[PDB]
UniProtKB/Swiss-Prot annotation, chain A:
Protein name, as recorded: Envelope glycoprotein B
Family: Belongs to the herpesviridae glycoprotein B family.
Described purpose of this protein according to its UniProt entry: Envelope glycoprotein that forms spikes at the surface of virion envelope and binds to the host cell entry receptors MYH9/NMMHC-IIA and MYH10/NMMHC-IIB, promoting the virus entry into host cells. Essential for the initial attachment to heparan sulfate moieties of the host cell surface proteoglycans. Involved in fusion of viral and cellular membranes leading to virus entry into the host cell: following initial binding to its host cell entry receptors, membrane fusion is mediated by the fusion machinery composed at least of gB and the heterodimer gH/gL.
Entry coiled-coil feature ranges: none
Full-length numbering of the shown residues: 573 to 674 of 904
Glycosylation (residues): N102
PTM (free text): The cytoplasmic tail is phosphorylated by the viral kinase US3. Phosphorylation may be linked to a down-regulation of gB expression on cell surface.
Quaternary organization: Homotrimer; disulfide-linked. Interacts with host receptor MYH9/NMMHC-IIA. Interacts with host receptor MYH10/NMMHC-IIB. Binds to heparan sulfate proteoglycans. Interacts with gH/gL heterodimer. Interacts with the host coreceptor PILRA.
Subcellular location: Virion membrane; Host cell membrane; Host endosome membrane; Host Golgi apparatus membrane
Intrachain disulfide bonds: C24-C61
Curated annotation (Swiss-Prot), chain C:
Function: Envelope glycoprotein that forms spikes at the surface of virion envelope and binds to the host cell entry receptors MYH9/NMMHC-IIA and MYH10/NMMHC-IIB, promoting the virus entry into host cells. Essential for the initial attachment to heparan sulfate moieties of the host cell surface proteoglycans. Involved in fusion of viral and cellular membranes leading to virus entry into the host cell: following initial binding to its host cell entry receptors, membrane fusion is mediated by the fusion machinery composed at least of gB and the heterodimer gH/gL.
Family label: Belongs to the herpesviridae glycoprotein B family.
Carbohydrate-modified residues: N31
Subunit structure and binding partners: Homotrimer; disulfide-linked. Interacts with host receptor MYH9/NMMHC-IIA. Interacts with host receptor MYH10/NMMHC-IIB. Binds to heparan sulfate proteoglycans. Interacts with gH/gL heterodimer. Interacts with the host coreceptor PILRA.
Shown chain mapped onto the complete sequence: 111 to 162 of 904
The organism's place on the tree of life at top rank: Viruses
Provenance organism: Human herpesvirus 1 (strain KOS)
Free-text description of this protein's post-translational modifications in UniProt: The cytoplasmic tail is phosphorylated by the viral kinase US3. Phosphorylation may be linked to a down-regulation of gB expression on cell surface. ubiquitinated.
Cell location: Virion membrane; Host cell membrane; Host endosome membrane; Host Golgi apparatus membrane
UniProt-recorded name of the protein: Envelope glycoprotein B
């Protein structure tokens, strides 16, 4: 994979598709530049800070679209395909999948 | 025992991805096993939303 | 012998899996210096010599 | 070592959910490994049906 600086990545305001009403992207869109002076590249978010070149994740519009997605060191909130705010890692209660061996 | 502890920490950090896949597959069972109480769940994206 | 009913979860409660914990590192180990040695003990034995 | 044994029992009881998911995914391989001989499995429903 090709590393990308955090500052070179931005969040699109909404996942709604203007061309096709009733359809929205299931994963937030990302506009990013390869370097500091690099051009912006239209893309879609992936899993664990991954960036997808193709904005192909398309789903029908759904009510109650309260979703969370990772973003750098924290999460980014959404409601009805609308950006809400950044979230820190500690903002969400953590359940431990690990099994302690003291 | 330090080798065992290091291997156990590596095993947890290494099965974390298996656990993520299992959460994507059967969120109710995975969330119940993780929390300790039988709870219904639904992964609303990168995070899991639960309900007792 | 128990039964449960799971209502459809909402966004009220959100949980996350713990991040991969930092595995402990092996100790640097006891830096051992080899070499010959001759342990000495207190001479409780007397000083014997031949006398006439 | 009692802590190790307790953690191992917890690890088995805790990976049982991953194993249920894996049975749902690849029943042939999962049943073969669990039994100990290369066998073919079918739609379990709630219990694996196998065949040598």
């Amino acid at each position: 994979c090709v590393p990308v600086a955090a500052d070179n990545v931005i969040v699109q305001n909404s996942m709604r598709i203007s061309s096709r009403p009733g359809a929205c992207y299931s994963r937030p869109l990302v506009s990013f530049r390869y370097e500091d002076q690099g051009p912006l590249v239209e893309g879609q978010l992936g899993e664990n800070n991954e960036l997808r070149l193709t904005r192909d994740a398309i789903e029908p519009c759904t009510v109650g679209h309260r979703r969370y997605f990772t973003f750098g060191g924290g999460y980014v909130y959404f409601e009805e395909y609308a950006y809400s705010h950044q979230l820190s890692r500690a903002d969400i209660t953590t359940v431990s999948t690990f099994i302690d061996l003291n | 025992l330090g080798r065992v502890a290091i291997a156990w920490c590596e095993l947890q950090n290494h099965e974390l991805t298996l656990w993520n896949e299992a959460r994507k597959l059967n969120p109710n069972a995975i969330a119940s096993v993780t929390v300790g109480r039988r709870v219904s769940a639904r992964m609303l994206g990168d995070v899991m939303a639960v309900s007792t | 012998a128990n039964f449960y009913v799971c209502p459809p979860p909402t966004g009220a409660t959100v949980v996350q899996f713990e991040q991969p914990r930092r595995c402990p590192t092996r100790p640097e180990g006891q830096n051992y210096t080899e070499g010959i040695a001759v342990v000495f003990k207190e001479n409780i034995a007397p000083y014997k010599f031949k006398a006439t």
